[PDB]
């Protein structure tokens, strides 16, 4: 009902056998660029957020993208999402911690996120008037994040269906995989596919 054509190259990325764990670590979560309440594990394959009350906590990938096609899977168990689970991208300067429960990713000009609980899109947004995407669907444990830096778009696929850009106008930026999380002991996995 919601499917869109994919950007050139994505099909091939999705067709390839999964990348080796070394490739996943190289583009995985950065232990030197995450919330003080987050522990990155297995060299970047996933992170665990420590139980900390009244705190939202983010992480960036190790590598920032400014050209080409980039896609990664996020695996985020349904029962470890809590009130605010957001998936998207951030500049190197987006804040990765705040002292309350919120959609931290997308709450400023440095980050763009999809709230996978509510289905809303956040950029420079405290929540109200945030649009629904797709323009609710249940986001399963796995979702695909698609950053096309040739066209300047961030979009998502679920269950084999690409949903088209969520955010446009991103050309010129350098953007990192990012999430923001609120759930005690949540484990968020990232599997970078390419390019």
């Amino acid at each position: 009902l919601y499917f869109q054509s994919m950007p050139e190259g994505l099909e091939e990325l999705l067709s390839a056998p999964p990348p080796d764990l070394g490739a996943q670590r190289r583009h995985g979560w950065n232990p030197k660029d995450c919330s003080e309440n987050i522990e990155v594990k297995e060299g970047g394959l996933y992170f665990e957020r420590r139980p900390v009350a009244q705190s939202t906590d983010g992480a960036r990938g190790k590598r920032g993208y400014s050209r080409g096609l980039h896609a990664w899977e996020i695996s985020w168990p349904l029962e470890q999402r809590g009130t605010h689970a957001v998936v998207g991208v951030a500049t190197a300067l987006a804040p990765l911690q705040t002292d309350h429960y919120a959609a931290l990713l997308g709450s400023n000009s440095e980050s763009w996120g999809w709230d996978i609980g509510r289905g809303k899109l956040y950029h420079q947004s405290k929540g109200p008037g945030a649009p629904q995407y797709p323009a609710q669907l249940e986001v399963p444990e796995r979702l695909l994040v698609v950053l096309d830096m040739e066209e300047g778009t961030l979009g998502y696929a679920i269950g084999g269906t690409y949903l088209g850009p969520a955010f446009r106008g991103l050309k010129g930026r350098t953007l990192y995989p990012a999430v923001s999380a609120v759930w005690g002991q949540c484990q968020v996995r990232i599997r970078y596919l390419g390019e």
Binding site: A53, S55, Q80, G82, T83, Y101, V182, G184, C186
Partner: peptide, 7 residues
């Protein structure tokens, strides 16, 4: 003894 978000 945890809150809404397991903290």
């Amino acid at each position: 003894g945890v809150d809404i978000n397991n903290n």
